[PDB]
Amino acid sequence: AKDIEISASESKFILEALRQNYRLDGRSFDQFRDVEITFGKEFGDVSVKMGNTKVHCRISCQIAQPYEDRPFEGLFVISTEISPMAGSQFENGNITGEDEVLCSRIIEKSVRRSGALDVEGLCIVAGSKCWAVRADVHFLDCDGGFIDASCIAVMAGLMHFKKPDITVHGEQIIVHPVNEREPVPLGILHIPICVTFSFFNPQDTEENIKGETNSEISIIDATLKEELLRDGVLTVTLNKNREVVQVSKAGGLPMDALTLMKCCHEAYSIIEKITDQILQLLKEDSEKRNKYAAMLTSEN
Amino acid sequence: LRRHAAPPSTNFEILNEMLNTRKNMSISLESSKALADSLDRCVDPEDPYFNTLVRIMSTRCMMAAQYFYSGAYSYPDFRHYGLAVDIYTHFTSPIRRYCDVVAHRQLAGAIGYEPLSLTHRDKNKMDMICRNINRKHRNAQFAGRASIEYYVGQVMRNNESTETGYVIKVFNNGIVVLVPKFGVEGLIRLDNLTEDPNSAAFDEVEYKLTFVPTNSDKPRDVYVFDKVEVQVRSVMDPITSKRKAELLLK
Ligand SMILES: [Br-]
Ligand SMILES: [Br-]
């Protein structure tokens, strides 16, 4: 594929800066990027921005029939297809690459598998008709942190989305339009948030395997340049209920167990601030839509 | 949480039938406020207890309130009819109610005092807790009312006294009168109600039972909601071994 050429000078500089408690963007080692959440006109339309990183998620649903195995559960899928828009490093439709499959699996284990969405409440008539919720993530601009950005984009979208109200007459489904009656929100059991840690070995492999004192550097939410020069990755997902949704350190630089535990506790402070942030932006968005609805009726 | 279903029309159609026929009144059933206002004006001037009798009788045709978890129903189903509130739960009595214990743990997690246990965030585990405390709640009140029944039945064990009674049910096999003094309902069979059971007639349209008393010979029409004098007496049935209260009207 198309490679990103990194000079020895750039490799040595960024690593040496870390040895001097410096990162290029001026952040701290434990500092998460400021997350900006923008909602569109339609429900389920959400735009997440972390520095230069830009992702967009769109929640949609349509009437479908549940699987034979699960007659009481609705359908839910998450799409995260990459495109050259985020950078020429990504091949169009490359859904089998190492980083792609990992990212796809992290999100799936954080939202799908974790049961963040109440799929039981997606059923209209058992074993016949149900809702099929779809989360489409669009990677617009890549500056690292695509996993953390996606997990927030999916969750913010699901919590913002509203499906058309339905009254049931036996098997006859009466789908009320938004013009008739208001749409119905989705059921969220918990709010999973991902925090990704990047590891750097300031020395050599020998001192990592048999070295007495540990000296490996770990930073939170790395940018693209920091992401291309790391030796190991850790993605930990938690919620406000003080529970670990999932942890994934798929190989890479061997890291001390206590250090990995420290990361999990550090991530918990971040996911708390992020979750409350999402909720507040959802309230204000609701207050904004209601205030306009009052100004539209008054003028009507 | 804890919800209370709105009473079906079928439950009050029989009560409104007796009201519109005998007392010429009715309950609206349009809304909880409408039901309350119409029940409030349902009062007889000659007897203040008449209003109480209708209330304690219209209570029997209310849907049972039940505990539940918010994921089992939609928001409009959280409605509590008897209290006219959009949402409600039990929280004020954790020593005597386990439901309040759950609510306490959830509130503690709500304010951020301590993370809520996994058992109170599992839709499956919550369903088992709700179905259990609902059954234990019913068993509690029934056992409680049965305890009253036994002790009151022991008070009237070897005693006879002319008390005040009210006809709540009228049938062709006899009548059922309620004694507010002891809070015990009694059944007066037609054989012990009057003489010559073949001469007695029952009008379902008017809920009237006409018969000729044992100690008399004058055709008396006994309607519903009537305040009648009743001699109380208790006797343990030799078959059921249950202390029942045999009542003889006068
Ligand atoms: Br199922
Ligand atoms: Br950078």
Side-chain angles (χ1 to χ4, degrees), chain A residues 1-67 69-94 96-171 173-179 181-272 274-290 292-294 297-298 300, chain B residues 1-29 31-45 47-170 172-180 182-193 197 199-210 212-214 216-217 219-232 234-238 240-241 243 245-249:
Chain A
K2 310 180 186 302
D3 303 324
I4 298 185
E5 315 291 351
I6 302 179
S7 61
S9 302
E10 184 174 343
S11 300
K12 292 178 300 180
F13 181 83
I14 298 185
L15 187 55
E16 179 61 23
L18 292 173
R19 278 185 285 239
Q20 304 187 18
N21 273 95
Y22 285 154
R23 38 196 308 190
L24 276 59
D25 66 331
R27 273 189 291 142
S28 179
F29 286 177
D30 64 334
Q31 182 179 352
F32 200 94
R33 273 181 293 185
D34 289 336
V35 43
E36 306 175 9
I37 302 177
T38 288
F39 302 100
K41 190 186 67 174
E42 302 295 352
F43 293 113
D45 194 310
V46 53
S47 301
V48 172
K49 191 175 303 176
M50 292 184 185
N52 302 333
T53 290
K54 306 179 192 64
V55 298
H56 170 257
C57 183
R58 182 62 177 273
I59 308 300
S60 66
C61 64
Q62 58 183 358
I63 305 298
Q65 50 190 12
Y67 303 141
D69 303 332
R70 298 295 183 266
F72 293 93
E73 293 184 344
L75 305 183
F76 179 49
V77 72
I78 303 179
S79 170
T80 53
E81 285 199 10
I82 207 72
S83 73
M85 173 174 296
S88 296
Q89 346 122 26
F90 308 109
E91 301 290 341
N92 180 36
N94 183 26
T96 56
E98 292 188 355
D99 299 87
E100 284 74 18
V101 178
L102 279 186
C103 172
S104 175
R105 285 292 293 162
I106 302 302
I107 301 302
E108 202 276 347
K109 289 181 291 187
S110 293
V111 179
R112 273 273 300 272
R113 184 195 181 104
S114 67
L117 177 59
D118 196 337
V119 290
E120 291 183 343
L122 263 53
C123 184
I124 311 174
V125 282
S128 300
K129 300 176 183 300
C130 69
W131 279 115
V133 173
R134 157 168 285 268
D136 292 326
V137 174
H138 308 144
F139 301 97
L140 305 173
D141 206 329
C142 184
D143 194 24
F146 259 174
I147 294 177
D148 302 343
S150 295
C151 186
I152 296 186
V154 174
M155 288 311 302
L158 288 172
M159 298 179 59
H160 182 264
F161 183 78
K162 299 178 185 302
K163 62 181 185 302
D165 201 336
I166 288 188
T167 52
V168 183
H169 290 0
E171 283 76 19
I173 44 176
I174 309 181
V175 185
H176 297 179
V178 72
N179 309 120
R181 310 212 303 180
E182 92 294 336
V184 174
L186 294 179
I188 280 75
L189 306 189
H190 62 114
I191 309 174
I193 305 294
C194 291
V195 179
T196 297
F197 293 76
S198 303
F199 307 117
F200 299 85
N201 182 24
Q203 296 166 329
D204 65 333
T205 303
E206 290 81 351
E207 204 147 356
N208 173 255
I209 304 295
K210 294 303 179 63
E212 300 183 5
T213 63
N214 306 336
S215 61
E216 295 82 3
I217 309 178
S218 63
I219 67 179
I220 307 192
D221 188 28
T223 63
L224 179 54
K225 278 177 161 47
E226 300 170 340
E227 178 173 319
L228 295 171
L229 297 178
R230 64 186 174 191
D231 298 285
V233 206
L234 170 68
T235 306
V236 49
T237 309
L238 311 96
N239 56 33
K240 288 194 62 179
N241 290 321
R242 200 183 166 80
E243 76 171 3
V244 171
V245 171
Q246 70 89 38
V247 168
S248 179
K249 189 189 175 305
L253 182 63
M255 209 71 182
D256 179 33
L258 299 186
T259 302
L260 298 179
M261 282 305 303
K262 180 206 65 179
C263 295
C264 294
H265 284 83
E266 286 185 10
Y268 180 64
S269 302
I270 302 181
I271 64 101
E272 281 182 345
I274 292 181
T275 301
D276 298 337
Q277 180 175 348
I278 299 177
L279 295 170
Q280 180 62 31
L281 301 182
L282 283 169
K283 173 189 297 181
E284 299 171 1
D285 176 86
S286 184
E287 293 172 345
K288 179 177 182 178
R289 293 176 184 266
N290 293 334
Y292 177 80
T297 305
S298 181
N300 202 336
Chain B
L1 264 47
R2 177 177 176 88
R3 55 190 276 254
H4 180 251
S9 296
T10 63
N11 301 23
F12 281 89
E13 278 185 9
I14 177 178
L15 189 63
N16 294 330
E17 174 181 348
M18 303 184 302
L19 286 179
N20 187 267
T21 300
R22 181 58 184 174
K23 291 289 184 176
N24 197 261
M25 290 182 296
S26 177
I27 312 181
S28 182
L29 266 296
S31 65
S32 59
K33 186 179 182 181
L35 189 149
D37 295 329
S38 54
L39 187 62
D40 204 329
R41 59 185 178 184
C42 184
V43 53
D44 184 87
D47 182 29
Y49 186 76
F50 174 75
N51 178 269
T52 308
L53 176 61
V54 180
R55 273 189 159 90
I56 200 178
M57 182 173 42
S58 63
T59 308
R60 286 188 172 91
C61 52
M62 278 295 171
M63 294 283 92
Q66 65 174 194
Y67 300 108
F68 72 106
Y69 63 96
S70 55
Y73 299 92
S74 186
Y75 187 80
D77 290 25
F78 293 173
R79 179 71 174 184
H80 193 290
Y81 190 86
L83 255 42
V85 292
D86 289 322
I87 191 175
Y88 189 81
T89 186
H90 275 169
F91 165 84
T92 59
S93 301
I95 305 181
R96 54 181 179 91
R97 293 199 299 252
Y98 186 80
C99 165
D100 307 34
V101 176
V102 180
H104 267 247
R105 299 177 189 174
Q106 290 184 338
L107 181 61
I111 66 177
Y113 180 86
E114 191 174 13
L116 181 58
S117 182
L118 311 182
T119 60
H120 297 340
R121 291 141 53 196
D122 195 337
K123 296 180 58 182
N124 178 79
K125 285 187 173 60
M126 285 294 296
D127 184 30
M128 297 297 298
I129 297 175
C130 292
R131 288 199 296 176
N132 172 260
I133 63 181
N134 281 328
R135 185 177 60 89
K136 296 278 97 178
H137 177 83
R138 175 181 290 100
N139 293 9
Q141 287 183 338
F142 271 141
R145 287 184 287 267
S147 183
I148 311 293
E149 178 186 358
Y150 165 72
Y151 275 156
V152 171
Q154 281 297 300
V155 172
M156 315 174 306
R157 184 174 182 176
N158 298 327
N159 291 90
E160 295 179 347
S161 60
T162 60
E163 305 293 338
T164 300
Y166 290 83
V167 182
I168 53 183
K169 179 182 179 181
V170 188
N172 50 15
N173 194 21
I175 57 177
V176 178
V177 288
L178 168 63
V179 183
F182 295 88
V184 180
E185 303 187 5
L187 172 62
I188 309 182
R189 196 173 186 174
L190 188 63
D191 299 327
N192 301 89
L193 176 69
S199 59
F202 179 35
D203 186 88
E204 179 64 27
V205 187
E206 290 285 340
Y207 282 92
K208 180 207 308 179
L209 183 57
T210 169
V212 275
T214 309
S216 179
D217 63 273
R220 176 187 178 182
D221 292 26
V222 180
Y223 314 92
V224 81
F225 307 153
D226 294 340
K227 177 177 63 179
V228 295
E229 184 179 4
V230 46
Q231 176 194 12
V232 298
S234 300
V235 45
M236 186 191 65
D237 189 82
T240 64
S241 297
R243 195 67 185 181
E246 274 282 63
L247 305 186
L248 294 179
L249 84 174

